[PDB]
Paper text:
Upon binding to the [name] (IR) in peripheral tissues, insulin activates the receptor, triggering intracellular signaling cascades through the phosphoinositide 3-kinase (PI3K)–AKT and mitogen-activated protein kinase (MAPK) pathways. The α-subunit mediates ligand binding via a leucine-rich repeat (L1), a fibronectin type III domain (FnIII-1) and an α-helical C-terminal domain (αCT). To understand the basis of this aptamer-induced full phosphorylation, we determined the structure of the IR bound to an [name] dimer linked by eight thymine nucleotides (A62D-8T) using cryo-electron microscopy (cryo-EM). Our analysis revealed three distinct conformations of the A62D-8T–IR complex: arrowhead-shaped (IRarrowhead), pseudo-arrowhead-shaped (IRpseudo-arrowhead) and pseudo-gamma-shaped (IRpseudo-gamma).
The head of the IRarrowhead is composed of the L1, CR, a portion of L2, and A62M, while the FnIII-1~3 domains are located perpendicularly in the center, forming the stalks of the IRarrowhead. In this conformation, the two protomers of the Λ-shaped apo IR are rotated clockwise relative to each other, pivoting at Cys524, which forms one of the disulfide linkages between the protomers. Each A62M molecule binds to opposite sides of the IR dimer, positioning itself between the L1 domain of one protomer and the FnIII-1′ domain of the other. The distance between the membrane-proximal ends of FnIII-3 and FnIII-3′ is ~42 Å. In the IRarrowhead conformation, both the L1 and FnIII-1 domains are involved in aptamer binding.
Residue numbers in the entry:
A (entry chain E): 1 to 160, 169 to 655, 756 to 907
B (entry chain F): 1 to 160, 169 to 649, 756 to 907
Write the structure that this text describes.
DNA sequence: CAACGCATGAGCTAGATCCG
DNA sequence: CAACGCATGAGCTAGATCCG
């Protein structure tokens, strides 16, 4: 048979030898086998227990900290292959920290699928270099066998097999003193083999019974099916654990087995691509009866079944497990008994939920003010009810002033009853709005939600406020609204002006951020206005804002204020929030204008957009200047030590880019470059200060050397005079002429003619010239460097 | 008379010319006089206004943005001198931003006391450089007269007095075209002077009527008394504002006027050293009857009289008003309607209050913790009562759990009634302690303080928890305590562990109130252990803490936990806090190794204490070894282009002297604790140093002799420095002839080694001077003697 | 009679219908 | 029968009376 035994789930063994007895009949093991951490175990109870039927290993096998073993071959006589379906601690097979292990005994290993072997901290093992991992491990670059007994060549290493020469040495490879590592001809690399060199069927491995048969060898490569295995079985069966394929009726049962939330190590197995895979990946969702994965058109809920049917949420961790959940098949209860700052984290943890079936209850919430973090809520089933058929419950909460924004929020209630008691910080009109937007309209308990204990302490207002005039400037805004007086003008404390900038318009209403939290609405107060007893007067109260960032939208509103007393009147008034943007002004300076020269007429400059554009800048303004040379260098004796070597004004309206190149200019000339970032131009033309950089273009190759008639005049005193022409456009400037002469058989003797010397003499001279035939050559050395040499002018002076 | 007119309080004028009429009769003005910002003013309304009877100015006079004036002389004819007791904006006089001022006109001004004068932004002013400020200003450097009409010399400057030569020029000094600056002989500097050069009485200034009379000149220097004045007034009177003396009968009346606290311009004047001073300074305190200031033995209360009897505090600002107050003569009510973090600021704001007279009311307090910020309260007088003769009021505070630690807190109550209603988190035993420590014992109302609305929600515990075994390490601490069970050992949720370090033992107790505090007792939870049903078992639950720094005292206690229910049992139990210190470990590396050479042998070392002490370091340990230099420079031609130690103890600096001179040393130091048991010492810090490159040993002294060959190539023989500054690398050998300079040569290390000297090829016959200098790698040394040798032609 | 002038514009002198 | 041995000490294998 290929596999006549039984499947065998991965076990864990520790502190005893009692629970290894379950290995009596299983032959192939799925998962991993792990035995570890046993101390009070004598070595003698090991010579009687064994398991001959074990061959296949899926993930890994590990033994660690064992006291009593000396050669495990008596325990594992027949295992041959490990699939390595899950790598263990980036390793495939490891033995570590052994005490009595005399020898390994793993003589049946044929081919390691994936991963590496590691042997460490074992001072009792030998024959470690006689394994030939390369013939079993397809990868050797990951092996790690250091600090063992074979650290010193001291353990024998004698064994009676081909003794391969894989390295530069004739090395003998044996497992034990009674066994070597079997190697047959390599005509087939991993197609299985026999002891006579005959390769068995192509699609199986290792030990074999009859060649060229996929029905009677031991282990085959791809899959397995009832004594046979083909590379891809037909779709009466669907692949499983990448070593089998089976009918859907088998693994439809496993999904049902632990659909009961009893053991969280399983998987609700799903069919996809002929695989009964644990989970179909993202962008795919489960179907009800077909057990396939639907392409998940758009976002798909990833339903999140609640345990126990009910749950309470009190801290970050209590809700952290709900992150990503969208639909709840139970009931939820919230109670933040105190807490510092959770309003900034609920959206990051639960602000993506939409559907729930149970009932929602809020109680004893201390620092809660709104329900905005419940973002995508639309419907509650209310399938289960609180005692008294209550679907929504609110009780004993001392800061709740709002629930939702019905201008852009929708919520539906299937059934149940609401409970609003001891909630003194929320007005009755808001819960009337709750009822109107909800499904219930007249389902009142009588006594229904409390109408007297809720909102009594909070003076909910019913009066609006409107502006009178708005003013704009670059930094300062002015406000002044229509004046107000309470029924008792004596009873009045003034107004508060809450504000903050906003790049959008999805700004929250006053959420009453009173406990710990993020940036609230920074605010100043205003003195109450002076009574005038006049219909027409300056009773319109205003206030100034000064420190503003220009060109920025800003949202503001004003709120009244009054004392608290026995009478339930003078609730004050509240304006409405609007949006107003500030004006723009001069922009900031551009950033890092980088100019680079490549050719003698090409100069490119690139910069960065200004840090503060202050509105949509229209274009960039550019300017340059052709710099001049140093006039003081004209009068330097350069043959003395010390020489130098360097490296309106028209404009354009450069638009819609970040760099510009300029051509048609002088060669090897310095240039001062300035550029202004600038906002909208034709009205109030205002630009920033120009960023100033300097740049010099490349020189011209021929500009340094001069060609022309080099004539000579001979004087009576053997002082020959020399006439020639200077470069018209030197690279920067000519600084010296490398004048020199050569008689035949004599080296290049060079003299100097400085700039001023050449200017005054219109040439040079050679005092004290020996009679002979001399060749005079000149190199026009400009400041850009040495030029080329002239023609060596021949002239012979006789005795 | 001397000062026949009237005293005249400092006055402020704006928006009109109306409020100047109050100065009809006053001649001497105290304080300052500010007139500014009038625009709807014709220039013609000033020619008919004057005050000819003004003499004295205390602080300063300021003209600012006046429209219509052109010459102040029509208004101020007799101003002479100013005391300048307070410098306005660090100046004595400033006229600024005038529009029509044509000529200045201050001609009667004689002497300034202190400060300087500044004129700015006035393009209508002339004769400005014709003043001679130095003869009125005792200081001139800080003058600032810039950007005026005299920015350009264009306004004429014709003017009819000496025209002094104070500068390098004969400059005329004159005020107007009708009057010039008046200067008399300086036989007396400012002792009063007439127009005939007759100096008046020594103790007066300015203009004067008859010479040498302390009774009929105009203004005097120090003080004033009834038409006379002496430099030190007799003590029937007390000096006031450093320009008069007067008896206490006057300034006590002003003290009694201000004790009616109606204006905030007060200075509650007290008598001290014949000066009825505003306030006798720190280290002093006034006495009631005698009006003197008591030496203030110890911290004296500086009583803070509360206004309008009562006050409420809700934010940081309302409390900052009473910062620095200790005794309050009223009643206070506190309502913290929320807030974020306030417990850490009440100490810094009001932690100096100890006594209160009225009553205390607390209501609607939300985010409170305790009243520990009331550090030193010991008595309430209760001289004002709440309705129903109530003195202490606590109501509708849904968070309060503790008031004071009465083991170390002393507090008594004089009279009144206490109130406790609707405070569901504070147990009644604390109120029992309040009653027992307070003055009252049974003064109850019936209904008195509510016994059901308070502490019902929070289960106050009545059981203690005791530790069983403690083990400590350098890094970790293990704890395990006695077993415990509720009457129903099902209802239970485990325990909490609150711990934190504390360098002292004045640690705040856990309070159970929600403070939005940056620091709180970091706490972990514990899983309740296994029920064993056996009295002798492993039921003792424990826990390990490991993330701790060595050698640090740590506070710890454990708290029970159980679900809330309807039955009023299973309150739990609470351990008492204790203190435990972790063990010590190896120290850290020392810091800042500094070595300096002050001789060729002395090497002074200085270091810094290490960052991590890990306990009191018992001593140090320093090791030094003999190190040296390299040898790759030996072949480079330079004409081209155990180790001894000592247990240093209880000091921060060290010197290694009495050792071989000019030797390189690598020295290392370690600091650590006790040695013979558990020999623990940290790592060392290495230093590298050289003694100073010497000045005489690098140079070599010896006979620089020469051997003459027949080919005019004279050999040179001398000796190398036996101990040079490291390694001699180049000898600055040179030869100098008569009429010739010190012509030089060079020799490398190997050349001198192979030749045992040098030579000179192609030498002119003459008396040469051969001088050599040692130029090693560390620098040049001294020259040898210039040797004389006279080879003939 | 509906911005600017006869200031400055947030550095011990007021604080943008604050002025007419 | 009251620290150590037949581990390590917070890097997918337990979590310091955790094993005796």
């Amino acid at each position: 048979h290929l596999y006549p035994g039984e499947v065998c789930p991965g076990m864990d063994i520790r502190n005893n030898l009692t629970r290894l007895h379950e290995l009596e009949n299983c032959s192939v093991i799925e998962g991993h086998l792990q035995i570890l951490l046993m101390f009070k175990t004598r070595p003698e109870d090991f010579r009687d227990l064994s398991f001959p039927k074990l061959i296949m290993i899926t993930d890994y096998l590990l033994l660690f900290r064992v006291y009593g073993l000396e050669s495990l071959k008596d325990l594992f006589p027949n295992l041959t292959v490990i699939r390595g379906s899950r790598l263990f601690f980036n390793y495939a097979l490891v033995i570590f920290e052994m005490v009595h292990l005399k020898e390994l005994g793993l003589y049946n290993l044929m081919n390691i699928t994936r991963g590496s072997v590691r042997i460490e901290k074992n001072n009792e093992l030998c024959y470690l270099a006689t394994i030939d991992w390369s013939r079993i491990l397809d990868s050797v670059e990951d092996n790690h066998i250091v600090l063992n007994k074979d650290d010193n060549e001291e353990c024998g290493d004698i064994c009676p097999c081909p003794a391969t020469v894989i390295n530069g040495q004739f090395v003998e490879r044996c497992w034990t003193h009674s066994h070597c590592q079997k190697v047959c001809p390599t005509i087939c690399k991993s197609h299985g083999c026999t002891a006579e060199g005959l390769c068995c069927h192509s699609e199986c491995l290792g030990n074999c019974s009859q060649p060229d048969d996929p029905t009677k060898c031991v282990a085959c490569r791809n899959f397995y099916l009832d004594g046979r295995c083909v590379e891809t079985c037909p779709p009466p069966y669907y692949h499983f654990q990448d070593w089998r394929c089976v009918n859907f009726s088998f693994c439809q049962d496993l999904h049902h087995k632990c659909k009961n939330s009893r053991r969280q190590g399983c998987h609700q197995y799903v069919i996809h691509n002929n695989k009964c895979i644990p989970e179909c990946p993202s962008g795919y969702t489960m179907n009800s009866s077909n057990l396939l994965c639907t392409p998940c058109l758009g976002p798909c809920p990833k339903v999140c079944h609640l345990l126990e049917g009910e749950k309470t949420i009190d801290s970050v961790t209590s809700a952290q497990e709900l992150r990503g959940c969208t639909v709840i098949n139970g009931s939820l209860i919230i109670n933040i008994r105190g807490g510092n700052n959770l309003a900034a984290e609920l959206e990051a943890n639960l602000g993506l939920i939409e559907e729930i079936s149970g009932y929602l209850k809020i109680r004893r919430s201390y620092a809660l003010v709104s329900l905005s973090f419940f973002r995508k809520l639309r419907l509650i089933r209310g399938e289960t009810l609180e005692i008294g058929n209550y679907s929504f419950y609110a009780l004993d909460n001392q800061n709740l002033r709002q629930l939702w924004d019905w201008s852009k929020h929708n919520l539906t209630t299937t059934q149940g009853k609401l409970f609003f008691h001891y909630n003194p910080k929320l007005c009755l009109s808001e819960i009337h709005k709750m009822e109107e937007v909800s499904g219930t309209k007249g389902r009142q308990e009588r006594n229904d939600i409390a109408l007297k204990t809720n909102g009594d302490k909070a003076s909910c207002e019913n009066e609006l406020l409107k502006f009178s005039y708005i003013r704009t400037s670059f930094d300062k805004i002015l406000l002044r609204w229509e004046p107000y007086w309470p029924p008792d003008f004596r009873d009045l404390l003034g107004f508060m002006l809450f504000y903050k900038e906003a790049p959008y318009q999805n700004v929250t209403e006053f959420d009453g951020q009173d406990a710990c939290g993020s940036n609230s609405w920074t605010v100043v107060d205003i003195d109450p206005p002076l009574r005038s007893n006049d219909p027409k007067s300056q009773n319109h109260p205003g206030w100034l804002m000064r420190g503003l960032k220009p060109w920025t939208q800003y949202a503001i509103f004003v709120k009244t204020l009054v004392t608290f007393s026995d009478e339930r009147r003078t609730y004050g008034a509240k304006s409405d929030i609007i949006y107003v943007q500030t004006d723009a002004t001069n922009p900031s300076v551009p950033l890092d204008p980088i100019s680079v020269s490549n050719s003698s007429s090409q100069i490119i400059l690139k910069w960065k957009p200004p840090s503060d554009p202050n509105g949509n800048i229209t274009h960039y303004l550019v300017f340059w200047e052709r710099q001049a040379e140093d006039s003081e260098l004209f009068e330097l004796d350069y043959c003395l030590k010390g020489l130098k070597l360097p490296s309106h004004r028209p404009f354009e309206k450069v638009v819609n880019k970040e760099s510009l190149v300029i051509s048609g200019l002088r060669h090897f000339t310095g240039y001062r470059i300035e550029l202004q970032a600038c906002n909208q131009d034709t009205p109030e033309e205002r630009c920033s200060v120009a960023a100033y950089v300097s740049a010099r273009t490349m020189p011209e190759a021929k500009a340094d050397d001069i060609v022309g008639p080099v004539t000579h005049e001979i004087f009576e005193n053997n002082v020959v005079h020399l006439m020639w022409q200077e470069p018209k456009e030197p690279n920067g400037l000519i600084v010296l002429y490398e004048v020199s002469y050569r008689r035949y058989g004599d080296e290049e003797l060079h003299l100097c003619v400085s700039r001023k010397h050449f200017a005054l003499e219109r040439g040079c001279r050679l005092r004290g010239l020996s009679p002979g035939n001399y060749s005079v050559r000149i190199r026009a050395t400009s400041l850009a460097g040495n030029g080329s040499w002239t023609e060596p002018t021949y002239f012979y002076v006789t005795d």
